[PDB]
Amino acid sequence: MAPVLGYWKIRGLAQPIRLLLEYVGDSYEEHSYGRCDGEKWQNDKHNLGLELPNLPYYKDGNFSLTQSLAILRYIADKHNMIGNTPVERAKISMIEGGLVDLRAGVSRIAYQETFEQLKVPYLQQLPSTLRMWSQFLGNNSYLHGSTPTHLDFMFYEALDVIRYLDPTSVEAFPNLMQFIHRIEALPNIKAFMESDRFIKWPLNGWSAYFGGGDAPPK
């Protein structure tokens, strides 16, 4: 029993978890719920031994978790990526909470039918948010320490999503673009990206008005 990751067959909250596992080279299986599997999830939700049922979930033996960040952190912790003193642990948790905000800012407008309207002040406020991340990353290859951690895969997925939303916003910060290309060049990430099990779309749940549907628009 390789561990199992359960989620919708979408990028969403689980994509940084899959990227991480692929990068560290850990075996896993996914239990994927497709667009028509709503009732199948409602059926399983309370039968999986989960203390706080939710998606995504992660199960390994008799151990189980929910909460995307707790699953990411469990895998990161096993690879020594969560820090080694109180000050370092807390800095990593601060960066995580920032990256969850960066990805959620998209999600919180993407499901509204007024998305095209909400996008306007969203795009007016985004340069200041991107500037803050650009300054924080500065000339570093990765967000914390000298090698990839779960924070880089959260950050990569948020930037790739935002870039899809408005490419000129992210292209305005050379270090953010270079960071996207850096993560995509990692040998295990490039292999995962080129493989049949990669999910390139949708970014959000299928019913979203941005980053939803079965296929990219056009």
Ligand X SMILES: N[C@@H](CCC(=O)N[C@@H](CS)C(=O)NCC(=O)O)C(=O)O
**Of 2 and 70, which has the nearer Cβ to a second copy?**
70
133 annotated among ligand-binding-site residues: no
**Residue 211 touching ligand X (CB under 6 A):** no
Kindly identify the residues of this chain, within the stretch 47-66, that bind a second copy according to CB under 8 A: 51-54, 63, 65-66
Least distance between ligand X and beta carbon 157 (Å): 13
| Cβ partners under 8 Å of residue 118, min gap 6 | 109, 112
Candidate residues 24, 118, 193, 199; the one interacting with Zn ion per rule CB under 5 A? 24
**Residue 207 touching a second copy (CB under 8 A):** no
Kindly list the distances between the CA atom of residue 203 and the CA atoms of 56, 87, 107, 186, in Å, as whole numbers in the listed order: 15, 34, 9, 21
**Residue 154 touching a second copy (CB under 8 A):** no
**Residue 77 touching Zn ion (CB under 5 A):** no
Q: Is 6 exposed, middle or buried (0-12, 13-18, 19+ CB in 10 A)?
A: buried
Q: What is the DSSP string of 40-97?
A: HHHHHTTSS--SS--SSEEEETTEEEESHHHHHHHHHHHTT-S-SSHHHHHHHHHHHH
**Residue 40 touching a second copy (CB under 8 A):** no
7 annotated among ligand-binding-site residues: yes
**Interacting residues with a second copy (CB under 8 A):** 51-54, 63, 65-71, 73-74, 77-78, 82, 86-87, 89-91, 93-98, 108, 132, 136
